[PDB]
Structure formats: C-alpha cells, structure tokens
Amino acid sequence: SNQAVKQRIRAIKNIGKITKAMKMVAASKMKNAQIAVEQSRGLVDPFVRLFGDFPAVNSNKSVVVAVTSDKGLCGGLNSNITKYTRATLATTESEGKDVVVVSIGDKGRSQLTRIESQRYQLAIADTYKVRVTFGQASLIVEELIKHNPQSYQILFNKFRSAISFKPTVATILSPDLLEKQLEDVTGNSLDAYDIEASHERSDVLRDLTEFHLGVTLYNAMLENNCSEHASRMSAMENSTKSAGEMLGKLTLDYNRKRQATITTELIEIIAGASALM
C-alpha cells in the first residue's frame, strides 16, 4: 500500500511547480499591462471633472455593467464584484426602475446568472483573448447603445497595487434625459462652457456621453485585466505554499510509512528465523 503516497508526492510536487510557473506568468503579465493602465487612466479624469460624479440618481432604465475575467483562476475577484453588483444595484433601486445587467467576461455569466437572471440580457465573452483595444470598447458600447437607458453603472476593480483591489462604479448618464437635467444648479453649470459644435448642445452631448461610455468601458476592461493578472499572481502563490505544506506533510508520512514497512518486514524475518532454530 506504499505506492499511493509516493505517486501522490509526485502529483503534488508537479502541481507545486505548475503554480510556481503560473505565479511567474501572472506577475509578468501584470507588468506589461502596467505600461498601459496609467496611460488608459488618462481619459477617466476629464469626464468626471466635467460631468461630476452622480451615481445615486433615480434612473428609469439603467444598464449596470459588471466586467469580469475570462479564466477562472481569479482569487477573490469575480465573486467580489458579483456581490458588489447586487450591493450597488440594491441601494440604487427605490421605485422599481428598468435594469439591464450586462456582464463582460466568461466568469460573469457563470456567477451573475444565479442572483440576477431576470434582469440579465448581455454576456460579452473572450474579451481578453489577444489584448484590449479601443474599437472593441466602441463596439460593446454601441451594443449597449442599441437600447436607450437613462444611466450606466460600470462595476470594475481598480488596480491600485498588487494587494489592494477596490471595486469601482463608473457612472455614465443619458445626455438630454438625465445628464443636462442633473447639472441644473441655479440655471445650468454647463452653460458657462461655450459650445463649439456643429449642431446644438442636445446632440453634441449624445456624442460626448457615447464617447464617455466607450472610454470608461475600455478603462474598465483594462483595469480588470491588470487586476486579474495581479489576483492570479496572489492566488498562484497561495497554491504554491499550499502544495509546499501538503508536500511536506506527505513526505513526513512517506518517511513514517517507509520506516513502518521496513520494521514490519524485518520483524517478519526475525520471527521466521528464531522460531526455526
């Protein structure tokens, strides 16, 4: 029966080297996205210093977008924003608004279908296949724009460092229905900005909020990618420690089983010999 614990040591040791390889993979790929996230952080400040930050608005129809990962080696990432989806979708509902939950990533449809399926319409997958590109963001934004909600909420994890992943709600409002309505403070705080558009303000704000949605969704599915590499890094160095301690315990049990088998089969020989002569 001593052949089980040796092949189990063989299995756990190569699992340990697998995760010792994939911690290298994830911590490497966290850095090649780090030359792009702070660059993709460039267009997220002008819109919020222009439009403000107004999440808790009584929208009539709203598309909340919870962008998740592709491969399910996340480690406190996908289910985190899955619970954050209902936690930021429940404080916003007070009068029964239309809600269109959209999940980006293959690990979104596997988890968000359980809690909110009746308000679940779009599941965008294979988005981190090659890399993240802006025209992909424009296309998914247009596929949200086919419907005409009154607001948007974008649930994504802000990659600040390799330890802290605070999820964020990026807010995108409807241009004439709610965006210009929320700026009404003693007139309009937007009218001090002089328009330099072709047509009126009412259809340049449409272009502005479509660009805002596309930019912030691009930033969301880049920051979730970089925090996914960071969280797979933080999860593959716990599997390495786990397959280190499991290998240590199984090596101790292999040594104890080795000593027990050699002592028992030696006792067998001595009991066979002294009961003969």
Binding site: S1, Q3, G72, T264, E268, A271, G272, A275, L276
Partner: protein
C-alpha cells in the same frame, strides 16, 4: 455490469462497513422468488456459511430467512467467534461439503463464504501454535492453498456426471481499500470475478457501493440474461464515460455543453443502480 453465472466463483470484497453481506443476502433472498417460478431441475439451494461472525448476527439472519421464507432452501453454517480457531478454519470447507451434495446430484448450488479474511486468521492461530514458521504478515505461505483447495471446489460439472453446478461467493474484508493486503491478493487471483465495494461511494449515495471501474467478471456476457446483454452493453460504457468527465470537472474549470450531457447521462444512471436493503427485482 458484473453478471454471475452458475459455476463462477465471484468475490465480494469491500471495506469494513460497505454493503458486503447485504448484497450477498439479496442473492439468497431472491432465490426464494426464482425457485417459486422455475421448475424442479434448475433450482438453486443457497448455503450461507458464517466464519467468525457475531452470534447475534447469525441469529438475526435466521430471523430474516424465516421472516421471508428463505429458510426453506438455506443451510446456515455458523462458526461464531466463540468457536475456537480450528472450527473457523474448517467451516468454509464443511459448508462446501454440505453444498457439494447439490453439485453431486445434478441440482445447482450456491455457497457464500462470509469473511474468508477471518478464516485465514483462524488458520493463522493454529499454524502459529503448532510451531509452523510464519511467512507474510504472520501467515504461513500455504494460505493460498488454504483458499485454493476450497474455492476451486465450486464448479459446474459436465453432463455425464450429473450436470450440476456450485456458485461460490467468497467475502473479503479489507482495511482502508487496501487491495494490496496479503489475504485479499490471494482471493482476487483465484475467483473469476471481483465485486469491489468502496466506502466513500457508500456514503455518496451509491448503495450497493459497487466500484464499477474495478468490478469485472471473467465469465463475462456469455453467462447473463439474454435481454440484458443487448441493452446494458452500452451501460458499462456509459458509466465508463462518466468517470473521466467527472474527473475533470471537479475543479470548477470549464464545461463543453455536450460532455455536460454525458456527465448528466451518467448521473441518471448512477442514481439508477441504487437499490434498497432487502429488495429483489
């Protein structure tokens, strides 16, 4: 999946508490139902020998056999643990002699050696007390000849000698799924089949806990009911394709939506092979 023909030594091996005795008793209980339907010539006369069992257990089984009516056809050779080790060494043999009368005179016999791993202990006691030198783990080397002299007596004779038969059912108790134990490794090579029962399947709902990857019968589909051969010929394949698709999906990694069906199809079959305590179908 492991069909049992008349003249086959089929081993029922498990852990301490699996469905070992209860899957043997169902073979005796059902021989009340068949023998009230088959003619006189092809009647099966069961013999259940108890080696080293508790004496309250044997009084429960004769309570059970007289409760269902199986005692009309059953001899119950009890070598309880109160009996000395020269009795429990002998009682599988003497049970076979009481059963070989039915193989002598053209009828069909059935014998179930309960816990032959306690016959070897009662042979280990005398051989270590007659000063015979111990071999493996304490057993003398001829503990294979202990069982091979016994299990090879279960045979289906030829048609000039009466045409009788005698189906054995040796029962072996392992420790922790230790099929590499010395006593068990003798009997697995002797018997035609093997019905290996596992306890971690027994608590997962599979009752009888037949570890269906490890249960084979060398007599095979030549000796089964003809209606079940054409039908269940894909059954052992459909359980075979259940295990490796359940050996991959356990991580929570990925589904293929068609191998999800072949894992679902095996799940309608895994719950199909469960049976109750004393139920013959």
């Amino acid at each position: 999946l492991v069909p049992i023909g008349r003249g086959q030594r089929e081993l029922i091996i498990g852990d301490r508490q699996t469905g070992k005795t209860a899957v043997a008793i169902d073979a005796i209980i059902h021989q009340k139902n068949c023998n009230e339907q088959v003619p006189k010539a092809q009647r099966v006369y069961c013999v259940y020998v108890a080696v080293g069992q508790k004496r309250s257990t044997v009084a429960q089984l004769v309570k059970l056999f007289t409760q269902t009516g199986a005692m009309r056809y059953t001899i119950m050779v009890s070598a309880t643990a109160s009996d000395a080790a020269p009795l429990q060494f002998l009682a599988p043999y003497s049970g076979c002699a009481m059963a070989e009368y039915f193989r002598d005179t053209g009828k069909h016999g059935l014998i179930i050696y309960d816990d032959l791993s306690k016959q070897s202990v009662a042979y280990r006691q005398m051989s270590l007390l007659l000063r015979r030198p111990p071999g493996r783990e304490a057993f003398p080397g001829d503990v294979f000849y202990l069982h091979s002299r016994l299990l090879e007596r279960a045979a289906k004779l030829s048609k000039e000698l009466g045409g009788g038969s005698l189906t054995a059912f040796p029962v072996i108790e392992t420790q922790a799924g230790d099929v590499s134990a010395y006593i068990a490794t003798n009997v697995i090579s002797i018997t035609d089949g093997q019905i290996f029962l596992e306890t971690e399947l027994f608590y997962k709902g599979i009752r009888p806990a037949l570890n269906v990857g490890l249960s084979v019968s060398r007599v095979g589909s030549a000796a089964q009911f003809p209606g079940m051969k054409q039908v269940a010929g894909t059954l052992k394949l459909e359980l075979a394709q259940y295990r490796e698709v359940a050996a991959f999906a356990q991580f929570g990694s990925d589904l293929d939506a068609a191998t999800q069906y072949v894992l679902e199809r095996g799940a309608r079959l895994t719950e199909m092979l469960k049976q109750k305590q004393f139920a013959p179908i």
